Write a protein that binds this ligand. Structure first.
Ligand SMILES: CCCCCCCCCCCCCCCCCC(=O)OC[C@H](COP(=O)(O)O)OC(=O)CCCCCCCCCCCCCCCCC
Ligand code: NA
Length: 501
């Protein structure tokens, strides 16, 4: 029910060792490692908690997420990697500089900082949620602990990604292997899932309100993962540092393979989790309050006769998530210093520049902890929360980049107005859904079992995967229209720039 004795020791020892190695790194590349770094940059305990739960509650439709990811990678390697290897170097928003203006560069950097801050807040909340659900500590003590450890990793801590990805994969495989053997027979699990309508691959429901479906997954995942891989500063930084566009596409391929493995393993583990709870769903029984508590519960249930392992898995999912959060915070600080402060403070006390970078890292860590606390209080849903954070905020940024590249007739006022309109629409739909969320029947939640305004109904029910796609598209539409209203930009006035070349 709540770890025990051996698994408490396992959790504590593993977390202490992880902190020690982090401090050692902070005090004391090839396509494959950098691609696995690309994969690890966005996979954390959020995906451990959410993907199995979403698969269990909807059923093997979540595999279509992989397809979305696939599209993302392809588009990147064919739309943004070539241009961010010849035109936009060093930074990603320098393209917005040399294309539209420095004002658009500042707008893009601010959007990236806000999106990353909120995403890292959700990321920090995920291990806090794991600790609260497992160890029993109230969510606020768990948030205090996770924030303290993340700030220790960032301020003090200053192949780790490969280790994280392999740990995620092995954990998922161990869970879904122990579950199948305990239940008895992979064929039996598949048959039980089929009976309870968990094998639902071919879902083409054109209704956007249906939370998960091929039509929703392809477009929404493509757009969100593009905003997270095609224009994200960290990912593009990892591209341009790969030393070759052709060898950067190899990194993207490795990243895509890692994402495929993680998502497939998580969905299969979620199906095993449901078939484990085929007759008595914990949600109906009240054993847990939110679906995000599904994964920590099963881990406790499966290995009740095998102490220690739950602590190992849920301490790996803690340390890896904290490493991801610290990398995000430090990247935010570095981006702020390099892209904003340095231009207006060119040669003032490089030691002061290091001091300012440290201060920004601390400020961003604190802000991310505050966002984690807000997410804890402000309802729940971590996988949807992260995709609505990276969707509404960064979606318009991807729209700005795509308008700057694809459309020759795009101008600084055009892209700025498009960004404003896209942010407005995306936040409008997000708040409408938060206040007036759709029901389980509308979204498409599969049946459970316990035997052991017109606008708010037609729009706010839109699948969360459509938030980002709603923003980006808006930025591409409005930004285009205003461009042709104020003044169409001339192809001659642009350098290589546009993908058309
Ligand atoms: C040009 C530059 C533009 C710069 C950015 C401008 C827009 C700023 C908007 C800031 C708020 C965005 C909120 C996005 C999430 C949408 C939502 O309703 O929640 C989804 C989702 C709600 O849960 P759900 O119902 O599962 O989606 O979000 C969360 O779970 C966390 C929400 C926390 C938002 C905190 C925002 C306030 C700032 C705190 C600063 C701390 C220091
Ligand atoms: Na996510």
């Amino acid at each position: 029910a709540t770890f025990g004795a051996w698994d408490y020791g396992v959790f504590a020892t593993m977390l202490l060792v992880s902190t020690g190695i982090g401090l050692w790194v902070g005090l004391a590349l090839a396509a494959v490692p950098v691609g696995l770094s690309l994969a690890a940059s966005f996979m954390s305990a959020v995906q451990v908690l959410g993907v199995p739960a979403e698969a269990a509650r909807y059923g093997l439709k979540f595999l279509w997420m992989c397809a979305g990811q696939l599209l993302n990678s392809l588009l990147t390697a064919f739309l943004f990697l070539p241009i961010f290897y010849r035109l936009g170097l060093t930074s990603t928003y320098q393209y917005l500089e040399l294309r539209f203006s420095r004002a658009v560069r500042l707008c893009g950097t601010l959007q990236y900082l806000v999106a990353t801050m909120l995403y890292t807040g959700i990321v920090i909340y995920a291990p806090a949620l794991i600790l609260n659900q497992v160890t029993g500590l109230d969510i606020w003590a768990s948030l205090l602990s996770t924030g303290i450890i993340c700030t220790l990793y960032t301020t003090v801590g200053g192949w780790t990604d490969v280790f994280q990805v392999v740990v995620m994969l092995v954990g998922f495989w161990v869970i879904l292997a122990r579950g199948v053997i305990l239940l008895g027979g992979p064929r039996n699990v598949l048959s039980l899932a089929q009976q309870h309508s968990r094998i639902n691959l071919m879902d083409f429901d054109p209704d956007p309100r249906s939370r998960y479906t091929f039509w929703t997954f392809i477009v929404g995942g493509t757009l969100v993962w593009l905003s997270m891989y095609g224009v994200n500063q960290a990912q593009v930084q990892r591209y341009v540092a790969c030393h070759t566009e052709g060898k950067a596409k190899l990194a993207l391929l490795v990243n895509q393979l890692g994402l495929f493995l993680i998502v497939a393993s998580a969905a299969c583990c979620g199906i095993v989790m449901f078939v484990y709870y085929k007759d008595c769903d914990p949600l109906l029984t009240g054993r847990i309050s939110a679906p995000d508590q599904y994964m920590p519960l099963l881990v406790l249930d499966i290995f009740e006769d095998l102490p220690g392992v739950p602590g190992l898995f849920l301490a790996c999912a803690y340390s890896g998530t904290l490493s991801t959060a610290s990398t995000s915070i430090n990247a935010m600080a570095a981006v702020t210093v390099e892209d904003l402060i340095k231009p207006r403070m060119p040669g003032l006390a490089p030691r002061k520049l290091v001091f300012i970078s440290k201060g920004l890292s601390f400020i961003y860590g604190s802000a991310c902890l505050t966002v984690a606390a807000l997410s804890s209080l402000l309802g729940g849903g971590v996988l949807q929360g992260s995709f609505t954070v990276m969707g509404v905020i960064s979606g318009p940024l991807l729209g700005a980049f795509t308008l700057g590249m694809l459309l020759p007739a795009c101008n600084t006022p055009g892209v700025l107005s498009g960004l404003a309109a896209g942010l407005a629409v995306s936040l409008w739909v997000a708040v409408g859904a938060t206040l007036y969320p759709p029901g389980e029947q509308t979204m498409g939640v599969l049946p459970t079992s316990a035997a052991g305004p017109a606008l708010a109904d037609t729009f706010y029910a839109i699948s969360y995967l459509y938030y980002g796609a709603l923003g980006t598209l808006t930025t591409m539409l409005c930004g285009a229209l205003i461009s042709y209203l104020t003044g169409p930009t001339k192809r001659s006035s642009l350098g290589p720039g546009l993908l058309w070349w």
